[PDB]
Design a protein around this ligand. Structure first.
Ligand code: ATP
Ligand code: ATP
Lengths: 858, 378
């Protein structure tokens, strides 16, 4: 048996090298647009992909299960896959025989007539004012504006409009376009030829390097006012080089740039006030564009078409490209189509090919390790929104996230991937998580259709709807399944090599299909379903992600200890009360979601690598538990409950917390009373960035001493309820460097009968650098708070004002950036005649401010 | 090296050798001007469609040479099958002014700047421009940008073999000219003039073979000219029995074959078998389309991977596409609202038979000609 072990090892190492080579080849192939590949390479690449899947499965089986029978099966599979690889190689070699360029589809749009644009006037004039802005604009230094958004939004159209409108008030100008993979010589020659067609008429034939072309541009622009537009910048190096030609100073000249990437726009402009963000059209404008394009002269939509028209317009989303293409599709210049045909189109040509080719530029530009992470979005239903934590953990489980560095956490890598996808304007972010990050994301619908078609052409994902997207006609090997319409019934006897199953149905028939036959799974996601109990979760041996949230599960089989590979375990909204003991023996586990009403077993100290722990119980617990808590060293998120926890042992808890060096967020929830932990002389962890006590009925005493800006250099969030606030407490908060968000409650004002006391700030300037929101609920004063002009970034202020103080000035010119104020008045001490007086007074004080914020007296 | 387009020499044919142009030439000229204030109406576009060898560019050239005087600038450009847009735009520019843009073919700018040059030169002028031999839609979609501004009194002409392209060029379906073959008397005079050039007297023994040959030609000038050169044999007119042998069955012939094969080499790959399949049926009869469609489906030429498609309508689409490219003449109306039958020209049929025979696609059994293959077991 010794010989067999030696052989299997050798075979596995060979497979690993072969896998590296295959992935290199596939990544090289997947860059070419589909119009330049030939069929032979495409077919061969598909087959290579399938072989790659099989070899990955074999390697994983060896890693997990390592006896005689296992080694025999593994040796058999090894031999078979090697044979198949050789055969495919010979096949390709057998029939190999060696034996113009199109134009950018976006070029024709520059010759569209001007009387066919619907709603430009407003945006055009706003941009023009952003350019000139004054009477002496012809004497200020050089300025740069940038425009960002997704494709088909109308950026170059707006730039062209403004350029044609105001080019008269300058000396020279040009309108250049940079593509995805540019040649810098061509761009510089384009600029030169645009500046003067007569002098540099033959400049495209000259053969000099970039330095001499840049020198020519610099010499020509000496002592002139110029307006230059640069279009379609796709990364940073291009701008870094072109910026050299505009190095000298020239009073009155202007630059405009348009792009799809956000970091590029931040690198172009100086201030974040010189960025214009394109946004889609409103509903009325979109409807008029639609009508004009199709019903062109009548502009009268018949009634039977109204509701399908509205649903189509909702699907378009206000993006002019989609509106125009679908309107041309439905126009059918010969004849308007029939209502049922409109329905068929809604449920489901040259213009369509052009739109697809245009939108795919952002996909063909991604790095190779980001393409799967995008296609993975085709699993979720159409219009809903997706939690980002779900995405990140599923990406890590599937194996899309990896690195070779020794000191890296996969969670922050995944977060970086998500932020990069958002950066390229392919995802709309929504909300703010409870750990200070994005909450969810949305996807446009046409993009979703493109992604679904792309991922279907490669057996990446198979969706199950009954009307559309049925089971593939001839496919025996399906890896990832997505159940969305429970009406269908599933065979699941040929799907031996599954990897991931997801059910989106509230339906009972959803729980019908058998799962224990998928002997190789990695992702089981039953969030929301009404399954009742799962005893077959053991015997799977391959899982990485077990998602049971919002299900009716009462208890777990005490065999989960067998799943030695299990990254995530999500139990929230279930009916479980006590976790099985064997849970302790899951050595690789990185995330544990749980409710505070669940009992955890004793030996929790063994679960190293825990990076996220949610809602500890902390009730009916002895000391060795709170001491074990100090062993989880690489833990970045924590949440406590202090429900039945006896507040006599808080010191051990605070030491255990101070033991965690890497840590970002922290919660402490307390029902009532005075918080008897986190005493002074605590030495919090250095990297802390977010802190919150959402109790609102359990107070601190005066203030923790460890809030000084030396101990907490990083902090961008705070939420505290003190017993009684002093005047020199806000001072300590002024000392904090970042402190983006802040919220303080005064416990004595509400629960006790104390009165609002006016706090006074003194001895300093620039008290609140980077404070965009502040909610002094329980304590209020506008002027005396901010002297000399401090916090020149605030945008929302919450304060209280007694009607007694009608006779202090409410001048809002200390603070430039104000945009919203919420006030509440206490009227029992003073009469109504002072009440309405103070109301009108602060209203006028808000009206005088140039930004004109909004008020609320309540 | 590379050869030159065989259709290029035809532009230098003498004008006194064209037989029946006057009528069609004047009809087209009237379709262009059409009134007294034609020099004040908006820009108009005309298109000409038909099969190869019918005489489209000849007619366009005639009208152009006749009426070019009443304009300011003009050009006569030809687009090939696989064009380079830079070359087409440079051709237009060089045709508009040979002196100013004399070296334009050496400039190296992209299409946007060439289009801008064309737009700037045509400002405030009346122009007449002919664009020839358009083979698909993208080409016109791009070239149309140079004529975007409005210019009262200017005219465009385009010639093509494809019908959808002509529908995409013109606005109204009244601005389409459909070429049609010559009548019988005109064809006969062209024949005689071509061969008996001075006598113009056909001997009697040759009358009936002459009539059968003219019926086989079908009124297409290319075929008439090539067969007349074949029978002329400038040294000596051939013998009557040799005429019979030719009827039952060289440089000009190679040129004609090469010219007609452009429409075959342009088809999509999944349509080439469907065309060769037509070499099964006899010569002059007409073919039911339902028979064709069901036999195509049975043979296995029609397939798709989509889940919700019916093969019958796919086959119907294939048939309509073959009709669209002017390779089939449709006839009648079926009892379900579609075409009934189709006809094929005879020279096209001979080309198809030779092509399909060189690959064992089909074996025909006639006794006089087309006997069993000499060495073929499969
Ligand atoms: N206000 C409008 N009214 C009518 N059509 C518009 C309007 N804005 C844009 N369009 C149309 O949208 C199409 C695409 O717009 P455009 O190409 O200017 O967007 P873009 O931001 O340049 O896209 P990309 O980022 O891909 O370059 C153009 O054909 C244009 O005609
Ligand atoms: N009325 C006519 N009299 C004599 N010869 C003619 C006449 N019309 C056309 N021809 C001859 O027919 C030959 C081919 O005609 P032409 O090339 O103009 O047709 P076409 O429509 O341009 O063909 P294609 O579609 O292949 O370009 C030319 O050599 C020309 O001499």
């Amino acid at each position: 048996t010794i010989t067999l072990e030696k052989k299997v090892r050798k075979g596995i190492e060979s497979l690993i090298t072969e896998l590296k080579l295959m992935q290199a080849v596939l990544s090289k192939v997947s860059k070419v647009p589909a119009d330049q590949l030939d069929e032979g390479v495409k077919i061969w690449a598909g087959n290579v992909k399938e072989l790659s899947y099989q070899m990955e499965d074999i390697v994983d089986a060896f890693m997990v299960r390592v006896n005689g029978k296992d080694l025999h099966r593994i040796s058999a599979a090894l031999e078979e896959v090697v044979l198949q690889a050789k055969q495919l190689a010979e096949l390709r070699q057998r029939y190999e025989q060696e034996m113009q360029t199109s134009v950018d589809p976006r070029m024709m749009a520059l010759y569209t007539d001007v009387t066919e644009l619907v709603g430009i006037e407003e945006t055009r004039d706003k941009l023009i004012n952003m350019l000139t802005e004054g009477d002496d604009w012809s004497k200020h230094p050089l300025k740069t504006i940038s425009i960002v958004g997704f494709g088909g939004l109308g950026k170059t159209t707006l730039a062209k409009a403004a350029y044609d409108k105001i080019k008269v008030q300058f000396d020279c100008g040009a309108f250049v376009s940079v593509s995805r993979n540019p040649e810098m010589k061509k761009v510089l020659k384009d600029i030169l030829y645009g500046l003067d067609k007569v002098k540099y008429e033959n400049i495209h034939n000259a053969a000099r390097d970039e330095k001499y072309l840049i020198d020519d541009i610099i010499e020509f622009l000496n002592d002139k006012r110029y307006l230059i537009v640069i279009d379609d910048i796709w990364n940073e190096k291009a701008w870094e080089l072109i910026k050299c030609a505009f190095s000298k100073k020239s009073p009155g000249s202007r630059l405009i740039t348009t792009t799809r990437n956000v970091s590029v726009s931040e690198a172009c402009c100086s201030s974040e006030d010189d960025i214009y963000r394109m946004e889609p059209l409103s509903n009325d404008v979109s409807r008029t564009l639609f009508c004009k394009r199709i019903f062109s002269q009548e502009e009268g939509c018949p009634q039977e078409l109204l509701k399908v028209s509205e649903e189509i317009l909702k699907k378009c989303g206000g993006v002019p490209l989609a509106i125009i293409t679908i309107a041309s599709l439905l126009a059918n210049k010969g004849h308007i189509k029939a209502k049922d045909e409109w329905y068929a189109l809604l449920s489901s040509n040259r213009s369509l090919e052009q739109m697809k080719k245009i939108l795919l530029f952002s996909y063909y530009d991604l790095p190779s390790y980001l393409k799967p992470c995008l296609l993975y979005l085709s699993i979720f239903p159409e219009d809903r929104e997706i939690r980002r934590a779900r995405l990140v953990w599923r990406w890590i489980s599937e194996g899309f996230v990896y690195s070779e560095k020794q000191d890296i956490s996969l969670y922050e890598l995944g977060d970086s991937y998500f932020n990069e996808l958002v950066n390229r304007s392919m995802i709309q972010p929504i909300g703010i998580d409870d750990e200070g990050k994005v909450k969810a994301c949305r996807v446009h619908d046409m993009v979703l259709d493109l992604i679904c078609s792309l991922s279907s052409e490669e057996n990446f994902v198979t969706i199950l709807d009954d009307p559309r997207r049925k089971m593939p006609n001839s496919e025996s090997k399906v890896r990832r399944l997505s159940i969305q319409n429970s009406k269908i019934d599933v065979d699941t006897t040929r799907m031996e090599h599954m990897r991931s199953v997801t059910v989106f149905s509230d339906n009972v028939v959803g729980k019908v299909l058998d799962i224990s036959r998928f002997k190789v799974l990695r992702v089981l996601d039953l969030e929301g379903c009404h399954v009742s109990d799962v005893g077959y979760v053991g015997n799977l041996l391959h899982l990485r992600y077990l998602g049971l949230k919002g299900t009716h599960v009462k208890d777990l089989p005490m065999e989960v200890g067998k799943l030695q590979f299990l990254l995530t375990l999500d139990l929230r909204g279930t009916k479980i009360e006590v976790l099985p003991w064997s849970v302790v023996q899951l050595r690789r586990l990185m995330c544990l979601y749980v409710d505070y009403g669940m009992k955890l077993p004793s030996g929790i100290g063994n679960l190293t690598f825990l990076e996220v722990l949610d809602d500890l119980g902390l009730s009916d617990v002895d000391l060795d538990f709170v001491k074990e808590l100090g062993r989880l060293t690489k833990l970045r998120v924590l949440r406590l409950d202090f429900h039945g926890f006896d507040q006599s042992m808080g010191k051990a808890l605070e030491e255990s917390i101070s033991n965690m060096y890497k840590l970002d967020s922290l919660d402490v929830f307390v029902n009532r009373g005075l918080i008897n932990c986190l005493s002074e002389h605590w030495v919090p962890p250095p990297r802390l960035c977010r802190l919150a006590f959402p109790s609102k009925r359990s107070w601190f005493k005066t203030l923790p001493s460890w809030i000084n800006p030396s101990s907490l250099p990083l902090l961008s969030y705070l939420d505290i309820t003190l017993f009684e606030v002093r005047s020199e407490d806000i001072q300590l908060l002024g000392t904090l460097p970042a402190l983006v968000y802040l919220e303080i409650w005064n416990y004595s004002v509400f629960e006790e009968a104390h009165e609002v006391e006016a706090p006074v700030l003194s001895s300093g300037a620039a008290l609140f650098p980077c404070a965009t929101e502040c909610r002094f609920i329980g304590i209020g004063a506008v002027p005396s708070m901010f002297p000399q002009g401090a916090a020149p970034r605030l945008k929302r202020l919450w304060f209280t004002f007694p009607a007694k103080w009608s006779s202090i000035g409410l001048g809002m010119r200390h603070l430039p950036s104000l945009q919203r104020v919420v006030v509440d008045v206490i009227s029992e001490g003073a009469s109504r005649e002072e009440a309405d007086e103070a109301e009108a007074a602060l209203r006028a004080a808000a009206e005088d401010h140039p930004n004109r914020p909004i008020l609320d007296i309540w």
